[PDB]
């Protein structure tokens, strides 16, 4: 139904050791499709999905220009920010930018995002209406005044409500094989006797796409959130995902415990039992 495009930029200062590291990556939904790495040989934006390879040389030339331009502005911002926060010259700091657009089920513009972090903290971010800014701290308030005065948001809104969405629709149809699929998780539970008196029950979901999933345990139907170990959904490496959730229970009580799995590729929510 609905889909997203995101770019993610990461700049990292290494003072005296040369210029910053700059890495830019593009995604449609959970599928990466481009990279740029400023320390790489090629100095090009590169394809990372099969369906992007058909784009012609204007695309690749254009995206390389744009991303190198971004790398330059982050290079400048690293200096500015170190200034504003009164930090020493010699130490490594990080800027991060993400932006992108969401489209709805009929592939119409739904939402835009444009936001910045400095040393892993929100810095400034476009508000949902794409006309205002959210700045917490004083440095970013200063940035806000400047960007309000230069009308930065209307330029970003234009991209987000137009160009961004046009490219996403194009990618959705050219990468229909990969992007317009749903792979239901292959599910099961494992039991391992840690000792005589207790057992680890682990609920597995494998080989699924997209990444979004919910795994929950219940004991006699009662949610077991606080006693659940839930690992981060993780790439299998073949364009599908994996995830598990575990509970440690008293030997003999296994039949009280049920696993519940929710995914887009499942016709109905799935309950797994010890039975």
């Amino acid at each position: 139904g609905s889909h997203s495009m995101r770019y993610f930029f990461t700049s990292v200062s290494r003072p005296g050791r040369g210029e910053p590291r700059f890495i830019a990556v593009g995604y449609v939904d959970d599928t990466q499709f481009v990279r740029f790495d400023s320390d790489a040989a090629s100095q090009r934006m590169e394809p990372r999905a099969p369906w992007i390879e058909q784009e012609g040389p204007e695309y690749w030339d254009g995206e390389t220009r744009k991303v190198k331009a971004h790398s330059q502005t982050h290079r400048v911002d690293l200096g500015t920010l170190r200034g504003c926060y009164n930090q020493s010259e010699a130490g490594s700091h990080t800027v991060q930018r993400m932006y992108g657009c969401d489209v709805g089920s009929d592939w119409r513009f739904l939402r835009g995002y444009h936001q910045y972090a400095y040393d892993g903290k929100d810095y400034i971010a476009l508000k949902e209406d794409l006309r205002s800014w959210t700045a917490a701290d004083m440095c970013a308030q200063t940035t806000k005044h400047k960007w309000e005065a230069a009308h930065v948001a209307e330029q970003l809104r234009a991209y987000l409500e137009g160009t961004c969405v046009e490219w996403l629709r194009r990618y959705l149809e050219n990468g229909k094989e990969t992007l317009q699929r749903t792979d239901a998780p292959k599910t099961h539970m494992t039991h391992h006797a840690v000792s005589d008196h207790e057992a680890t029950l682990r609920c597995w979901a494998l080989s699924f796409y997209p990444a979004e999933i919910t795994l929950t345990w219940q004991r006699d139907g009662e949610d077991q959130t606080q006693d659940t170990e839930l690992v981060e959904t993780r790439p299998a490496g073949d364009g599908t995902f994996q995830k598990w959730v575990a509970v440690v229970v008293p030997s003999g009580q296994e039949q009280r415990y049920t696993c519940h799995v929710q995914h887009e590729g499942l016709p109905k929510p799935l309950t797994l039992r010890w039975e």
Binding site: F8, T10, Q96, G120
Partner: protein, 100 residues
């Protein structure tokens, strides 16, 4: 000044069956800052040919990488992932456990 500790998972792409080729993964997520050292180990020794994904990050700005290589699981061979990061006082080693 913010730091976030890596969450480390070591796992096969497919269900492991001894003597059949597979792919051995070490996923590291939830870390900040991005400078990280990740090796795959075979019987406590560094594996040389390993590839990794392009640096990206999650909505909370924490970073994630996948490190991977082709392997053939066997009965006798042990695999692990070794990680160092500013947040770890000593390198963390997580063993591959195929029975989980």
């Amino acid at each position: 000044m913010i730091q976030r500790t890596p969450k480390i998972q070591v796992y096969s792409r497919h269900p492991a069956e001894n003597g059949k080729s597979n792919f051995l993964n070490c996923y590291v997520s939830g870390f900040h800052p991005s400078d990280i050292e990740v090796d795959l180990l075979k019987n406590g020794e560094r594996i040389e040919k390993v590839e990794h994904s392009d640096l990206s990050f999650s909505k909370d700005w924490s970073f994630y990488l996948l490190y991977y290589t082709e392997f053939t699981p066997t009965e006798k061979d042990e695999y692990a992932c070794r990680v160092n990061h500013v947040t770890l006082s000593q390198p963390k080693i997580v063993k591959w456990d195929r029975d989980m």
